[PDB]
Design a protein around this ligand. Structure first.
Ligand code: NGT
Ligand code: NGT
Lengths: 623, 623
């Protein structure tokens, strides 16, 4: 392709995106609306409102031509001034520089204005050697390189940090200078000057960036004011306490020229009678005066990944607008439920959230790709969800999602959606969130299978086996992303065999069938152990491709423990079969429902997303 | 031997104890002081104040004879009306019936009046299926059998339970009927009728026993009143809240005929300005009035395992005397610091505690054998400590500790004390508690060794190697306890190699010596891996001899994780050596002190006793 009207900067960006765009022998001229592309017979005119929108416009041109269109007539008016993707870099997976750059390229093509990294403790602060210690924290140079790459595409960069809670990986260090910063649990001590010193250190680090927009956190500080704070000061008004801390942090941000966003949940939890987020709260006048003074100094971010109807989001927006007009929305790219994402669920809720955002004058949507409890899901697992949100933002529909996605990823959208398969059990109601058999079927014990009442052995096993087959074929046409489909093919195959053995043991033991137990012990057990080893190897390839090495160690621990537990199950069965023991006491125990979260929806599967609770009923982190 | 004046019950006990006593062809006749033994020329008279003291008296006689005495003339007056041993059955290791019986025999010979088991959730309660689920909870029949065996020696049985906090293994269950019982963290909800229903269930279970003496717990409920309690009730006077709960619990106990003890720490924590135990107390007038009525109905147990001077204990007794004259003391049999006990430290503090308990006219001493953070230490690891407290109680000195211990165990006291060796680093000040390299040298990572600054790579390694040799010889002469010494011999040998390799890789990586890194990778790593496998096998034999199978699973997880991390370290080094990677980022990180707990003492070693924090700097239990 040849171009008129490009700047040298845009030339540079197009060189980097050529491998996606492959525009062929056409002439493009760059000259009201977010995006317009029009032309035919080898001549196309593109226009854009914000500079970064050039890259979605050119993706759209590419996708149209690739689909076989000669005449192209595209006009989009985006609903949101800003559309961001936030990757979790705090749940053990720290995105490596190469993968950050790739993600930025794809986001540029999709139409995102902004890239964000969620970093609790995973950046460096002067004279805080324990902050991010052995975590793969980003150096200032690494953050600058990521920011600068985004800026090459006229994209913004917004760090998402923590200035109150969600600092467990820092406050664990038994060092006087760290411990003195603590209130309780994962929460920093409000009113402690060494805490404001720390927070100023965070801003000093981020002030080395160009960006002056930041998310300061402040979600989920449930026991704020009730720890060392209570010992020092007695019981205080916790709503005002939050306001006080927030004003202190905004004052620090102001010193360095930053404008701030924060997660909004604590205002609602502190003012509602049952301490919940989804609540219309009455605000005491003294708190009102305080919030009224802070509403123009911070953007509140309403986060919600769960509702299946527009009206449910609308209610929360109305709750928020009683506090402030400046409300941003965070929607979900579901990749925090184990090893397997849920792009399908992401789509379902995004459609409805987008309706509510448009009704409530939202100017910014932040798509959050959390990594809860170890960061076991691929960083690129959620490309479909990210395209979905871009389509919703730009077109208000998903009519062109496949066409556009092919340019973004080089593979078919429906194929890519099959990455979800280890969560897509047959018969599951589609509107229930967090149902994650991919993870709990993997990590549950063999002898003491705590999730067994939530498994339909034949139906689920057949689904996993079918899924492995499907993904084995998809990985052969998945281009640069084949590795993530290989991981999923292996996981599904492993889950099928793991169910067969685990459920087979329960049945055979109850029947006293030592012949069948022997069959399992001597043939199926070696196979399962090898499949786990092979899965570990593939997962480690995936992780190293995407992430810094730090944090893989927790997954080694989890896999190594699973392997040792498979060996124990073999040994215990062999001792029973041989007559060395008269019973296997583990197998004499009645298995109970693991939880009742979805009892009243009546399905068999559930949500279970804490490894240490899946893997054992014994103590393991407590004293 | 031939016995005169025994009841049928006593005759049976003598038959059972012959294997210890070896009295031979003598006559013993059962006729002012706790114990008297008097005779010569094959005829001896014994007398006791309390029936169980018969068995210590016969031990004294046995020891005297084995020492070559013909004429024997021994009198003892015990300082304490009751002397108890409490084994932990809540830290994953649930003592099995055979081991309970053995322990009771030994305790009878030493002079203990009482056997106790500490059971948070590890017993059965009607209609509470999650209470002790997959934990190896005791059935009523099992507790009755254990109590009855104690009773055969005229020893009492006292269950030690929890009626407030330390219930993490129960409250983790995501079941509405469990979650509704919670305040915060590991604490039950005071004032909730369903909690009193649960507590009444506890008493219904224990009422099947003969004993009507019970320790109801109530230690370490630090955030009591601050969770769901606070949302429901506002901020209340927490010392009064404790009294209110206690009164409900005592009313329940009364209904079933029980007399109660409780740990005393929360009264001090809630009525000190620092919130600590070892503090003077400001007792509000209203709490005084409540305490004054409750003090007549409960025995407060002052627990302290740490002080090196009588005066420090005395100060605490004085403060306790502000609340009540009925104060029992809990001393320590140090077995909660990993895989290896500390009988030596136990001795040091017991000498001083015994002085304070005598000065303060204490009637009951309970020696506690906690098992913190997984129950990894043998249940029989602390027999020396138990003899020491018995000698202190009966004779106020340790002049006959060895002679009497030989009766109790069949083996030499100083040999048995060597079981401590993995904690007895050269140069350690003897008065510092909790220093536990046995555990943290084992579980620390190889690539990312978080405890490395606390390890002296030649000095400690030599000590572990020397200890392995010493223990290998002791195990050959240790009879029925050889297995616990074999575990220790293996552990010490493993720690020596593990240090050699971990420090060796830091050095060879630093000096760029790929040849030596390859030698380590190819020769030493497979050796270390095999040693860990073998140690796991030996530990598992030890565990199964002593405990129910439930809880071993956590240790399989921990060892499996370590094995996998050893494998990872080999693989990462191999990739570096072979040129597949240009650096090993793990080994480029500066290693910091792990904690500063003993920094003020200028110490290299430290205390580190939570597996999840030793093993990785990553997140592993948090979301
Ligand atoms: C703000 C937010 N705080 C929590 C995060 O720490 C989790 O990762 C996320 C997904 O479970 O849920 C909420 S969103
Ligand atoms: C009462 C007591 N409660 C605690 C126990 O849970 C621990 O096991 C023990 C040893 O660390 O220390 C105190 S004593």
């Amino acid at each position: 392709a040849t171009f008129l009207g490009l700047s040298s900067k845009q030339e540079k960006a197009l060189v980097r995106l050529d491998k996606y765009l492959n525009l062929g022998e056409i002439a493009v001229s760059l000259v009201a609306t977010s995006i317009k592309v029009e032309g035919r017979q080898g001549y196309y005119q593109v226009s854009y409102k914000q500079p970064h929108q050039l890259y979605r416009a050119l993706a759209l041109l590419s996708a149209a031509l690739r689909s076989g269109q000669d005449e192209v007539q595209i006009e989009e008016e985006a609903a949101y001034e800003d559309l961001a993707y936030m990757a979790d870099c705090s749940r053990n997976a720290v995105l490596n520089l190469s993968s950050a750059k790739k993600m930025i390229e794809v986001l540029a093509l999709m139409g995102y204005s902004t890239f964000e990294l969620y970093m609790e403790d995973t950046y460096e602060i002067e004279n805080q050697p324990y902050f991010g210690y052995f975590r793969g924290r980003y150096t200032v140079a690494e953050l600058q390189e990521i920011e600068d790459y985004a800026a090459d595409f006229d994209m913004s960069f917004v760090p998402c940090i923590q200035t109150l809670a969600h600092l467990s990986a820092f406050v664990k260090w038994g060092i006087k200078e760290v411990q003195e910063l603590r209130d309780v649990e994962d929460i920093l001590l409000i009113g402690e000057e060494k805490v404001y010193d720390l927070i100023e250190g965070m801003f000093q680090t981020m002030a080395h960036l160009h960006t002056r927009k930041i998310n300061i956190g402040m979600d989920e500080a449930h026991l704020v004011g009730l720890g060392r704070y209570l010992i020092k000061h007695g019981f205080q008004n916790r709503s005002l306490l939050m306001c006080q801390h927030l004003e202190r942090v905004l004052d620090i941000a102001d010193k360095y020229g930053f404008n701030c966003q924060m997660w909004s949940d604590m205002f609602f939890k502190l003012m509602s009678a049952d301490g919940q987020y989804d609540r219309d709260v009455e605000i005491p006048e003294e708190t009102r005066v305080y919030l009224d003074r802070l509403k123009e100094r911070v953007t509140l971010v309403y986060w919600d990944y769960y509702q299946d109807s527009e009206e449910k989001y609308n209610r929360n927006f109305q709750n928020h607008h009683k506090i402030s007009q400046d409300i941003a929305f965070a929607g979900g790219a579901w990749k925090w439920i184990g090893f397997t994402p849920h792009n399908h669920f992401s789509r379902l809720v995004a459609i409805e959230a987008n309706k509510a955002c448009r009704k409530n004058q939202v100017k910014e949507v932040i798509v959050t790709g959390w990594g809860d409890n170890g960061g076991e899901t691929s960083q690129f697992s959620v490309l479909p969800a990210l395209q979905i949100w871009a389509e919703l933002a730009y077109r208000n529909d998903l009519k062109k999602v496949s066409e556009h996605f092919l340019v973004s990823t080089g593979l078919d959208f429906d194929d890519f959606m099959k990455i979800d398969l280890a969560n897509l059990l047959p018969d599951l109601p589609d509107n229930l969130s967090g149902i994650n058999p991919n993870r709990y079927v993997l990590y549950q014990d063999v002898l003491c299978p705590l999730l067994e009442q939530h498994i339909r052995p034949e139906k689920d096993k057949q689904h996993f086996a079918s899924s492995a087959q499907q993904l084995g074929e998809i990985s052969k046409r998945a281009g640069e992303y084949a590795y993530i489909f290989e991981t999923q093919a292996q996981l599904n195959a492993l889950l099928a065999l793991k169910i067969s053995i685990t459920s087979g043991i329960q049945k055979a033991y109850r029947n006293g069938d030592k012949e069948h137990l022997s069959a399992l012990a001597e043939k199926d057990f070696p196979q399962l152990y090898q499949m786990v080893e092979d899965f570990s190897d593939q997962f480690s390839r995936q992780w190293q491709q995407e992430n810094k090495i730090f944090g893989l160690d927790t997954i080694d621990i989890r896999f190594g423990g699973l392997l040792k537990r498979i060996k124990r199950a073999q040994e215990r069965l062999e001792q029973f079969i041989s007559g060395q023991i008269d019973c296997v006491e583990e197998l004499e125990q009645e298995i109970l429902p693991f939880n009742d979260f979805y009892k009243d929806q009546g399905l068999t599967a559930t949500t279970a997303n804490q490894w240490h609770l899946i893997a054992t009923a014994s103590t393991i982190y407590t004293t």
